[PDB]
C-alpha cells in the first residue's frame, strides 16, 4: 500500500499536556494550573501538568524522538499564558517566544514542517476570570493573540490550527463542566461557548487573510473532534436519522457555518428551538448569528482538520420529559457495539475513519484533509513491546489507504496522537498515548520508544504498508 508521494506523516502534542514549566520564566497561570492545583479528585490521583513530560526544559529530547521517527510534519501548540502571561500583548514573555522559535527553527533545519495550534484547551486564567468563552470579550482577545502569533512565527510557520476541538471544549469546559472552569451548565453553556468559539475563529481567519496571507502564504483551519456514528439498528429509520442527526450535532454544528454558509444546521436550530420553547425560554438556547455574522463566518477555513479516535452506535431517544441537555436536544443515546475492543472511551473501530473521511469529502466539497490527531492509549503501566496497539494502527492505516485509493479523499497529512505519553487531562498519566514512553517518576523524564514508534518509522520510511 503506497501512499501519495509527499504524504505527510506526523505526530502531535499540546502545550499543557507536555511542557511542564507551568510558572517558569514569568509564565502566567492557565485554567489547567488552577484546576489541577485545586485537587478534589477531578484528575486521576490529583495529578497535575506542573512538570508533565518537561518539554519546556527538554525540547532537545523531543527533537531526538521526532528525528528517530522521521516525521515530515510535527504538530504542537503554543501556550497563550506562556507567551502573554495576562492574555494580552501589554506584556510579552520573551523566553516564551525564544522557546517556540527554537522548536520551529530546529524543525525546519531538520526538514520537518511545523503545524501549530494556537489554543489547545488552555486559556490564560486571567481571561477565564473575564468570562472565558461565555463572554463576547474573548473574541477580540483571541483575535489579538492570533495576530501576535502570526506576526511572531508566521514567517516560518505556514500551517495553523486556531483552536483545538472547539466542539469538545464547548462541551467539556462549558456544558458538562468536566474541564476547567469546571461548572456544569447542562444544555446552556455549550452552545454559548460554541457561538463565541466560532466567531473568534472566523475573526482570526480574517486577520490572517487580510494582514498575513499575502506575504506568509500559509493556511489556517480549526480542528474538530469527530466520532463516526452508525444506527444501532441498521433497519430502523429512526436510528438511521438519529445517527445522521448526531453527526450533524457534534461535527457539522461547527463545520457548516465555517465551511458552508456561516449558519448552524437547520436540524440543530429547529431541535433546540422546539425544546427551548417547551422548557419556558422566551428565546432558543442556541444563539443566533446575525446576517452580517453569517457573511463574516462563511468560508473561514483553508482545509479540513479532523481528529478521529472512535465510533459509536446511535439510538433514537425521544425527549418525552423535555429534559435539559445536549443529548436530549439531539434526541439520541450512544453506546458501543459489544464486539469492539477498548481502552477507556477509545473503542477500536478503524473503519470509522474511512466512513468519516468519505463523509467529509461528500459534505464539505472535497476539501484538503489533515487528520491532526488519531491514536490509541495503553493503560498504565504499559508494555514497551506494544504489539497489540500497533495492530490497531496498522488497521487504521489500511483504512486511510482505502479512503485515498477507493474514495479519492484528499487526505494530505496524518498526525499520530501522541509523540509522548503525556498528561491526558482528567485521566492524568494513567492513559498513555505516546509513541514514546515517558517515566513520570524519574526527574529526567526519559523518553523510550514503544514498538509502535519503531513500526511507525518503518511506515514513514517506506511511505506505506505491506
Ligand atoms: C467518545 C464518544 C462520544 C460520542 C458522542 C456522540 C453524540 C454526539 C451528539 C451529542 C454531543 C453530547 C456529548 C456528550 C459526551 C459525554 C462525554 C463525557 O462524559 O466524557
Ligand atoms: C456545542 C455542542 C455540540 C456537541 C459537540 C460534542 C463533541 C463530542 C463530545 C465528546 C467529548 C469526548 C472527550 C474525550 C476526552 C479527551 O479528549 O481527552
Ligand atoms: C429573572 C430570571 C429569568 C429566567 C426565567 C426562566 C426561563 C426558563 C428556563 C427554565 C428551564 C427549566 C424549565 C423546566 C423544564 C421543562 O419544563 O421541561
Ligand atoms: O484524549 C486523547 C486526546 O483527544 C483529543 O480530544 C484532544 O485534542 C487531546 O488533547 C487528547 O489528549
Curated annotation (Swiss-Prot):
The keyword Cytoplasm applies. The N-terminus is blocked. It is found in: Cytoplasm, Cytosol. GO terms for cellular component: catalytic complex; cytosol; membrane. Changing residue 373 to Q: Loss of glucosylceramidase activity. GO terms for molecular function: beta-galactosidase activity; beta-glucosidase activity; galactosylceramidase activity; glucosylceramidase activity; glycosylceramidase activity. It catalyses: Hydrolysis of terminal, non-reducing beta-D-glucosyl residues with release of beta-D-glucose; a beta-D-glucosyl-(1<->1')-N-acylsphing-4-enine + H2O = an N-acylsphing-4-enine + D-glucose; a beta-D-galactosyl-(1<->1')-N-acylsphing-4-enine + H2O = an N-acylsphing-4-enine + D-galactose; beta-D-glucosyl-(1<->1)-sphing-4-enine + H2O = sphing-4-enine + D-glucose. This is Cytosolic beta-glucosidase. It comes from Homo sapiens (Human).
